[PDB]
């Protein structure tokens, strides 16, 4: 018999993104080629099957630095990290291939689905 | 020119609640009288003006245990902690006074607003 506040989840995600922009309580650096991205382990786990597996591992859960596969494009990762914290995906003709490949690697099934749909249309 | 996934914020919050239920990556214990509640500092900050102030403090940001004011009712806190992680508020005739008082202390303005509305109606 609970009541529900419709905007609560969106407001929580907006505040987590504000903490990220100000580098507050970030507990991991994701290294993609030369580029470094600070984030919250819990948010990465909540959005990605790959980060979920990494941070539930008894040894990896304690690492402050995670290095991604050298094939991963830093721009594709940046677009996906922004989507994790905002629900907004900057999908463009020039980045769609790098975004789909990065989403497949990160195991973000809903992003993979929209990339396949957008590629099929063109 | 981004696209948006409508269910993303709700799905993120659902996964954060799953991490909480399994005690994964919880980094703080909130002590309310004899009762202890494990949580994620980032989620508490995103939902509460009080936790936002506590964990942005250069000294308190590093504490693993936070003790609330002895006037705070553990049941009222538990109802509010569940709301933080689910958007669902278990508001009942028998708990509304303890829930409103705890929400005022935690600085959760939307919960305070619905409690005042429900009290006014009765």
């Amino acid at each position: 018999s609970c009541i529900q506040f419709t905007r609560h989840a969106s407001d929580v995600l907006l505040n987590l993104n504000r903490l990220r922009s100000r580098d507050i309580l970030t507990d991991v650096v994701i290294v993609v080629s030369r580029e470094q991205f600070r984030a919250h382990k819990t948010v990465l786990m909540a959005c990605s099957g790959l980060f979920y597996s990494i941070f539930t591992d008894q040894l990896k859960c304690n690492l402050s630095v995670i290095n991604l596969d050298p094939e991963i494009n830093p721009e594709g990762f940046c677009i996906l990290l922004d989507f994790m914290y905002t629900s907004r995906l900057n999908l463009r003709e020039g980045n769609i291939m790098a975004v789909m490949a990065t989403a497949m690697y990160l195991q973000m099934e809903h992003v993979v689905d929209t990339c396949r749909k957008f590629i099929k249309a063109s | 020119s981004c696209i948006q996934f409508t269910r993303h914020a709700s799905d993120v919050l659902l996964n954060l609640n799953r991490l909480r239920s399994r005690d994964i990556l919880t980094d703080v214990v909130i002590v309310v009288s004899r009762e202890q509640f494990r949580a994620h500092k980032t989620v508490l900050m995103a939902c509460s003006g009080l936790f936002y102030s506590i964990f942005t403090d250069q000294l308190k940001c590093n504490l693993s245990v936070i003790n609330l004011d002895p006037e705070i009712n553990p049941e009222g806190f538990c109802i509010l902690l569940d709301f933080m992680y689910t958007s669902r508020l278990n508001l009942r005739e028998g708990n509304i006074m303890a829930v409103m008082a705890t929400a005022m202390y935690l600085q959760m303005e939307h919960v305070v607003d619905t409690c005042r509305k429900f009290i006014k109606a009765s």
């Binding site: 609970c2 009541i3 529900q4 506040f5 | 508020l89 619905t114």
Partner: peptide, 4 residues
């Protein structure tokens, strides 16, 4: 607020 809504009835979920």
């Amino acid at each position: 607020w809504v009835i979920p």
